Amino acid sequence: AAQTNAPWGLARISSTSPGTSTYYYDESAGQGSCVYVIDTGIEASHPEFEGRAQMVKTYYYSSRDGNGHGTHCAGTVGSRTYGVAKKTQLFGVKVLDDNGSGQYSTIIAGMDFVASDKNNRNCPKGVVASLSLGGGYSSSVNSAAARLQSSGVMVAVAAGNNNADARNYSPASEPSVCTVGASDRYDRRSSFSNYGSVLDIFGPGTDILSTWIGGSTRSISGTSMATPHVAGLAAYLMTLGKTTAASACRYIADTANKGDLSNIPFGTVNLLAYNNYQA
């Protein structure tokens, strides 16, 4: 399948070169997979989600996304126009308040929630969780991410936006999950992207168009935006049967575009997420 005039990041993940604008992908499109977006919520009524999104849990007075960040990330996972995996099922877990903040205890509870809640959902092709969040190093936060991964969920986490080594941030620094840095449309490391040996992969993160609250759209930047590209890619590849939740991060690294990014610090992987789709 071909989506013309796609957001640059979608075109990038199906291309061996920057500078194109059509996204190519297998029409299975993540059907039968599920992606949890653990964030500020999801505006599931947005036409872009086509009834495939739903809120399943909140720790606050509403499950609605009063911020936009979670809706944007969910759109990059799975919206019809802005998403990588256009037929996946999206489940929102609101661990962040409408200012985008959340206590680590709530975030940990949300991860353990997903590890159990997947047993209440129909995801025959597999389960992914996208975590566009983080703070300073916490062994308890890392352990929660490790449990979620161990339970059979492909966990993708943001590296962070400090232009610093991600070893000092959580859940970015957890080795067993997929830690995602950000790149721009010219294949440069995004100016804010964290780096370091704990990163597994880069995805598009600068000037990413996606869904927003109020039935709208906007372009924003962050490792928060790169993470759902990888989460959606994992769901797509799992639906194709090419990999599993336990092996998808490694498979994405195996099959990535290699050595094509600029300003990658010595010791950080130079790997850009790529779907290897041959039309």
Side-chain angles (χ1 to χ4, degrees), residues 1-26 28-86 88-257 259-279:
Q3 174 189 353
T4 54
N5 297 111
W8 79 262
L10 300 191
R12 191 70 195 83
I13 67 160
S14 62
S15 184
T16 54
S17 289
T20 70
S21 65
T22 307
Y23 175 38
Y24 307 109
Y25 63 94
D26 188 276
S28 59
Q31 183 148 15
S33 71
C34 301
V35 186
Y36 287 80
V37 181
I38 304 174
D39 210 287
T40 64
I42 308 175
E43 188 175 278
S45 68
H46 200 301
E48 277 283 316
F49 295 123
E50 313 179 296
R52 290 179 291 101
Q54 40 263 311
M55 293 298 303
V56 300
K57 179 66 173 176
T58 182
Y59 298 90
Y60 306 90
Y61 51 81
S62 179
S63 72
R64 297 322 268 145
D65 182 9
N67 183 277
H69 181 270
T71 293
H72 195 275
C73 293
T76 297
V77 177
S79 65
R80 61 188 190 189
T81 305
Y82 311 99
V84 173
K86 298 176 187 301
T88 195
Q89 291 282 321
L90 296 162
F91 302 129
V93 179
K94 181 172 174 61
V95 300
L96 304 180
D97 69 21
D98 286 343
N99 301 311
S101 305
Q103 291 300 285
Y104 268 167
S105 58
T106 301
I107 291 160
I108 288 166
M111 285 188 260
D112 284 322
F113 171 88
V114 174
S116 179
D117 183 74
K118 69 176 189 294
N119 298 312
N120 286 322
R121 312 295 166 191
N122 286 298
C123 311
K125 296 307 188 179
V127 185
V128 181
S130 194
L131 279 157
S132 291
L133 56 74
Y137 180 85
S138 160
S139 61
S140 295
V141 171
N142 282 12
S143 178
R147 288 193 296 278
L148 181 55
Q149 177 71 51
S150 165
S151 84
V153 176
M154 191 286 175
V155 180
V157 311
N161 303 326
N162 322 93
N163 187 36
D165 197 309
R167 73 198 303 169
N168 283 322
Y169 299 91
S170 290
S173 61
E174 167 51 37
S176 72
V177 301
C178 210
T179 301
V180 183
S183 62
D184 77 13
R185 73 173 72 244
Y186 301 109
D187 285 350
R188 299 178 298 210
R189 181 169 69 86
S190 306
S191 56
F192 49 80
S193 184
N194 284 352
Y195 51 83
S197 62
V198 74
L199 269 69
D200 298 283
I201 192 67
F202 282 80
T206 298
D207 297 332
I208 305 303
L209 182 56
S210 191
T211 41
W212 200 253
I213 53 168
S216 70
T217 60
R218 67 178 59 186
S219 168
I220 55 163
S221 297
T223 61
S224 288
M225 288 55 266
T227 302
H229 281 91
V230 172
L233 177 59
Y236 165 89
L237 294 169
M238 293 153 65
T239 287
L240 284 174
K242 295 271 199 23
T243 191
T244 71
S247 54
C249 188
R250 193 179 296 202
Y251 179 84
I252 287 166
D254 285 349
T255 60
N257 281 309
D260 296 324
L261 297 170
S262 63
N263 201 35
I264 300 294
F266 197 83
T268 295
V269 294
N270 195 328
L271 298 173
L272 180 63
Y274 174 51
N275 74 358
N276 202 26
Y277 177 67
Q278 177 168 321

Short mmCIF file of all heavy atoms in Angstrom, two decimals, residues 4 41 43 73 84 88 103 109 111 117 119 133 154 176 194 205 208 234 254 271 277:
data_model
loop_
_atom_site.label_atom_id
_atom_site.label_comp_id
_atom_site.label_asym_id
_atom_site.label_seq_id
_atom_site.Cartn_x
_atom_site.Cartn_y
_atom_site.Cartn_z
N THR A 4 0.15 8.64 -0.28
CA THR A 4 0.85 9.80 -0.81
C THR A 4 0.76 10.98 0.15
O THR A 4 -0.15 11.06 0.99
CB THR A 4 0.33 10.18 -2.20
OG1 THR A 4 -1.08 10.36 -2.14
CG2 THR A 4 0.69 9.11 -3.22
N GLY A 41 -3.59 10.30 28.05
CA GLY A 41 -4.88 9.89 27.52
C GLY A 41 -4.88 9.93 26.00
O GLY A 41 -3.87 10.23 25.36
N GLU A 43 -7.80 11.14 22.85
CA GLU A 43 -9.12 11.59 22.39
C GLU A 43 -9.64 10.57 21.39
O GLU A 43 -9.50 10.71 20.17
CB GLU A 43 -9.05 12.98 21.78
CG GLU A 43 -10.41 13.56 21.46
CD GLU A 43 -10.31 14.98 20.97
OE1 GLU A 43 -10.20 15.89 21.82
OE2 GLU A 43 -10.29 15.19 19.74
N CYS A 73 0.81 11.18 20.28
CA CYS A 73 1.56 9.93 20.26
C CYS A 73 0.71 8.79 19.72
O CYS A 73 1.16 8.00 18.89
CB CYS A 73 2.06 9.61 21.67
SG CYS A 73 3.31 10.78 22.30
N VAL A 84 1.66 4.77 11.86
CA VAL A 84 2.47 3.71 11.27
C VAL A 84 1.63 2.45 11.03
O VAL A 84 1.75 1.80 9.98
CB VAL A 84 3.67 3.40 12.19
CG1 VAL A 84 4.42 2.18 11.70
CG2 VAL A 84 4.58 4.61 12.31
N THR A 88 -4.16 -1.10 13.82
CA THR A 88 -3.99 -1.61 15.18
C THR A 88 -5.12 -1.11 16.09
O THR A 88 -5.83 -0.15 15.78
CB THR A 88 -2.61 -1.23 15.76
OG1 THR A 88 -2.35 -2.03 16.92
CG2 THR A 88 -2.56 0.23 16.18
N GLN A 103 3.38 11.22 38.85
CA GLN A 103 4.25 10.63 39.86
C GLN A 103 4.72 9.26 39.40
O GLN A 103 3.99 8.51 38.74
CB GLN A 103 3.47 10.52 41.17
CG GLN A 103 3.17 11.88 41.79
CD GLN A 103 4.43 12.65 42.11
OE1 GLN A 103 5.12 12.33 43.08
NE2 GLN A 103 4.73 13.68 41.32
N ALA A 109 2.31 1.87 38.50
CA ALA A 109 1.02 1.20 38.53
C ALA A 109 0.45 1.03 37.13
O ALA A 109 -0.12 -0.02 36.80
CB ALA A 109 0.03 1.94 39.43
N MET A 111 2.11 0.69 34.30
CA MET A 111 2.83 -0.36 33.59
C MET A 111 2.37 -1.74 34.06
O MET A 111 2.12 -2.63 33.24
CB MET A 111 4.35 -0.21 33.75
CG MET A 111 4.93 0.91 32.91
SD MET A 111 6.72 0.91 32.95
CE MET A 111 7.07 2.18 34.15
N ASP A 117 -3.70 -6.22 32.05
CA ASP A 117 -4.88 -5.87 31.26
C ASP A 117 -4.84 -6.48 29.87
O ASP A 117 -5.90 -6.71 29.27
CB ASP A 117 -5.03 -4.36 31.15
CG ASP A 117 -6.28 -3.96 30.40
OD1 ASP A 117 -7.37 -4.08 30.99
OD2 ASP A 117 -6.17 -3.54 29.23
N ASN A 119 -4.45 -9.36 29.15
CA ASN A 119 -5.19 -10.61 29.24
C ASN A 119 -6.70 -10.41 29.17
O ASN A 119 -7.44 -11.40 29.09
CB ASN A 119 -4.78 -11.34 30.51
CG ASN A 119 -3.31 -11.71 30.49
OD1 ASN A 119 -2.82 -12.26 29.51
ND2 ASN A 119 -2.60 -11.38 31.55
N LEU A 133 7.51 9.17 27.98
CA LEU A 133 7.58 9.82 29.29
C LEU A 133 8.88 9.41 29.96
O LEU A 133 9.54 8.45 29.54
CB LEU A 133 6.36 9.47 30.15
CG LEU A 133 6.03 7.99 30.41
CD1 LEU A 133 6.99 7.34 31.41
CD2 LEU A 133 4.60 7.85 30.90
N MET A 154 5.90 -5.69 23.91
CA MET A 154 7.02 -4.96 23.33
C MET A 154 6.98 -3.55 23.90
O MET A 154 6.10 -2.76 23.54
CB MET A 154 6.88 -4.91 21.82
CG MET A 154 8.12 -4.42 21.07
SD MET A 154 8.37 -2.61 21.23
CE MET A 154 9.97 -2.42 20.38
N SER A 176 16.35 -3.81 29.15
CA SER A 176 15.55 -4.83 28.50
C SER A 176 14.41 -4.28 27.64
O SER A 176 13.76 -5.07 26.94
CB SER A 176 15.01 -5.83 29.52
OG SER A 176 13.99 -5.25 30.32
N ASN A 194 18.38 12.66 23.64
CA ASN A 194 19.38 11.95 24.41
C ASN A 194 20.08 10.91 23.54
O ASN A 194 19.63 10.56 22.43
CB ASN A 194 18.74 11.31 25.65
CG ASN A 194 18.45 12.32 26.75
OD1 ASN A 194 18.85 13.49 26.66
ND2 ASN A 194 17.77 11.87 27.80
N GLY A 205 11.59 12.26 15.00
CA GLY A 205 11.14 12.98 16.17
C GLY A 205 11.08 14.50 16.07
O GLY A 205 10.55 15.14 16.98
N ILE A 208 6.93 16.52 13.75
CA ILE A 208 6.08 15.36 13.47
C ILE A 208 4.62 15.78 13.55
O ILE A 208 4.12 16.15 14.62
CB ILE A 208 6.36 14.22 14.47
CG1 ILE A 208 7.85 13.85 14.48
CG2 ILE A 208 5.45 13.02 14.21
CD1 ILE A 208 8.42 13.44 13.13
N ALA A 234 6.71 -1.91 15.51
CA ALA A 234 6.69 -3.22 16.16
C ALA A 234 5.35 -3.91 15.95
O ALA A 234 5.30 -5.09 15.60
CB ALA A 234 7.02 -3.09 17.64
N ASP A 254 18.19 -5.02 13.91
CA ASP A 254 18.78 -5.86 12.86
C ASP A 254 18.48 -5.32 11.47
O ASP A 254 19.31 -5.42 10.56
CB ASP A 254 18.16 -7.27 12.87
CG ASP A 254 18.64 -8.15 14.01
OD1 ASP A 254 19.61 -7.80 14.71
OD2 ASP A 254 18.03 -9.24 14.18
N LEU A 271 21.39 3.76 13.99
CA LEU A 271 20.36 2.86 13.48
C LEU A 271 19.05 3.62 13.44
O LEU A 271 18.63 4.19 14.45
CB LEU A 271 20.20 1.64 14.39
CG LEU A 271 21.42 0.73 14.55
CD1 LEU A 271 21.14 -0.32 15.61
CD2 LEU A 271 21.76 0.07 13.23
N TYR A 277 9.79 -2.75 3.82
CA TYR A 277 8.68 -3.17 2.98
C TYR A 277 9.07 -3.04 1.52
O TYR A 277 9.51 -1.97 1.07
CB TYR A 277 7.43 -2.35 3.29
CG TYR A 277 6.27 -2.70 2.39
CD1 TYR A 277 5.66 -3.95 2.46
CD2 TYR A 277 5.79 -1.79 1.47
CE1 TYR A 277 4.59 -4.27 1.63
CE2 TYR A 277 4.73 -2.10 0.64
CZ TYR A 277 4.13 -3.34 0.73
OH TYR A 277 3.07 -3.63 -0.10
#
